[PDB]
Design a protein around this ligand. Structure first.
Ligand SMILES: *[C@@H]1O[C@H](CO)[C@@H](O)[C@H](O)[C@H]1NC(C)=O
Lengths: 216, 52, 230, 45
């Protein structure tokens, strides 16, 4: 089929700057098709640009669309807080068919911020259940790129943890991350030292938070 | 007496027309730098060729 | 105005069949088609099929050609999508946007694009039994955890299916509250963590309690969060 | 017993190429050949 490839996949840009989003077509398509859509987190997708350059009703004039053949671009000027979202690009086959795009994420606003790292040991009640969960929390950190490594008695552990990240916080445009280590109660008792190591762009030296089993 | 319309045939023919229209109107020919067809003076040889 | 109202969130067992409804108001229903596009978790939008109100014609995606049946009803402007043989990958949010103008020749590209979108319906397909959450506190650490910042939280674990609503101290605390997206564990039960930052001095002064509601299980659990002392 | 039936049909294939009539951009056909050469050996005879 007519696969569509979206260039840059993630773009970071301070408010009030022009932005260019690229959609590259595997085969040449008339400008009639290839419209541009907006998806805001937790909200139904919206239509921004229909056809190639025409502006949909109710869309701010700052949004502009352009392009031909293989290459199509979306240009946004005077970037405001309403604009930050994910953007998609699509076209049409003669027998109704609508190939979409991978998704360009406009995660934006800057000011590198150091993460605040805290570690939470498993509760005794959860230990009674038979499953143990150790939680390492990174709060108010930018950019979203962070690495957390789990160290049990100075032993690297792989495959026994999961991670979850919040979206951009409206107040400060910062992210927050949570890493959960899932273990059995016997494995939890077999070792005494538990630590999470955080490497971030803000932190010149990696920051490690640790606790000792049965010691508060 | 009564009147009703066959929807399917109408839309089939309209779809054919739509595909034709799509193949004509949508295309755009991109051309930036070209020859000049407006000539201020009489230059002889080169003018005749490019005008032709 | 032109408006599209979808069906309700649904939970289904693998191998079952689900029917989804999309209702149109304002614009003449027979003139435009209804086009269904879905978003899997952490995935881009994915086209499924197109149904016409003028004609009965249907076109389906290759991946779901056999399993998908789409229908239309003039009275009253209702489009139905039936998906059979549900699989774990079919867990997604399904949207129903307005489609091509099937009444007349088309020159504006506005009708050749999806314009008015419904809210979307979340369909979660998994064999897990519906289960209420278990709340385990995340205690404030010793050494004040920091000079002036104290972190405390609640772990919501082993719940199925989403959603859960978490509030702190019955809505009194709205500053610094972070509720992370749920993660699907290997067992098949979702897990979530909610934390908040409070002044270190206030730890003694104020009691912090997290409220968790799970409407599908009809289970509401409130757990006190306190620093452990030895 | 009495009364039989005779049907009249055309052939088809599992794999067929795509061509463009004036009306339809995409119509499938059984077998077709391209009219534009696009590959060269890289040698002069
Ligand atoms: C169909 O024919 C083309 C032309 O030879 C060939 O490249 C292709 O592999 C065949 N099979 C399919 C599934 O397209």
């Amino acid at each position: 089929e007519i696969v569509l490839t979206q260039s840059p996949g993630t773009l970071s840009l301070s408010p009030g700057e022009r932005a260019t989003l690229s959609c590259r077509a595997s085969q040449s398509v008339t400008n009639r098709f290839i419209a541009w859509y907006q998806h805001k987190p937790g909200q139904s997708p919206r239509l921004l640009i229909y056809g190639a350059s025409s502006r949909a009703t109710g869309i701010p004039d700052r949004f502009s669309g352009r392009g031909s053949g293989t290459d199509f671009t979306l240009t946004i000027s005077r970037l405001e807080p309403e604009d930050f979202a994910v953007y998609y690009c699509q076209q049409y086959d003669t027998s109704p068919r609508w190939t979409f795009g991978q998704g360009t994420k406009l995660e934006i606003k800057r000011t590198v911020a150091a993460p605040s790292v805290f570690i939470f040991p498993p509760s005794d009640e959860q230990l009674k259940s038979g499953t143990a969960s150790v939680v390492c929390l990174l709060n108010n950190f930018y950019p979203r790129e962070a690495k957390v490594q789990w160290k049990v008695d100075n032993a690297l552990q792989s495959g026994n943890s999961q991670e979850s990240v919040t979206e951009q916080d409206s107040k400060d445009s910062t992210y927050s991350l949570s890493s959960t280590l899932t273990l059995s109660k016997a494995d939890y008792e077999k070792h005494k030292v538990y630590a999470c190591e955080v490497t971030h762009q803000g932190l010149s030296s990696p920051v490690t938070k640790s606790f000792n089993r049965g010691e508060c | 007496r009564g009147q009703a319309a066959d929807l399917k045939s109408t839309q089939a023919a309209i779809d054919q027309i739509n595909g034709k229209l799509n193949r004509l109107i949508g295309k755009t020919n991109e051309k930036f730098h070209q020859i000049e067809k407006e000539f201020s003076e009489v230059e002889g040889r080169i003018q005749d060729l490019e005008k032709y | 105005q032109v408006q599209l109202v979808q069906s309700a969130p649904e939970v289904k067992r693998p191998g079952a069949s689900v029917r989804l409804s999309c209702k149109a108001s304002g614009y003449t229903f027979n003139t435009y088609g209804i086009i269904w596009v879905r978003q899997a978790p952490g995935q881009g939008l994915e086209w499924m099929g197109w149904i016409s109100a003028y004609t009965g014609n249907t076109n389906y995606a290759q991946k779901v050609q056999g399993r998908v049946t789409m229908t239309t009803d003039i009275t009253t402007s209702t489009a139905y999508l039936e998906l059979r043989g549900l699989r774990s990958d079919d867990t997604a949010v399904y949207y129903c946007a307005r489609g091509l103008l099937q009444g007349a020749v088309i020159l504006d590209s506005y009708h050749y694009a999806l314009d008015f979108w419904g809210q979307g319906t979340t369909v979660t397909v998994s064999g897990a039994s519906t289960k209420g959450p278990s709340v385990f506190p995340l205690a404030p650490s010793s050494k004040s955890t920091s000079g002036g910042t104290a972190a405390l939280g609640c772990l919501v674990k082993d719940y199925f299916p989403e959603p859960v609503t978490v509030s702190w101290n019955s809505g009194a605390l709205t500053s610094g509250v972070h509720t992370f997206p749920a993660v699907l564990q290997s067992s098949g039960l979702y897990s979530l963590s909610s934390v908040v930052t409070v002044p270190s001095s206030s730890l003694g002064t104020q009691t912090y309690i997290c409220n968790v509601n799970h409407k599908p299980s009809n289970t509401k659990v409130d757990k006190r969060v306190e620093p452990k002392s030895c | 017993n009495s009364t039989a039936t005779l049907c009249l049909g055309h052939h088809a294939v599992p794999n067929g190429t795509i061509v463009k009539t004036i009306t339809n951009d995409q119509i499938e056909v059984t077998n077709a050949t391209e009219l534009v050469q696009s590959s060269s050996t890289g040698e002069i005879c």
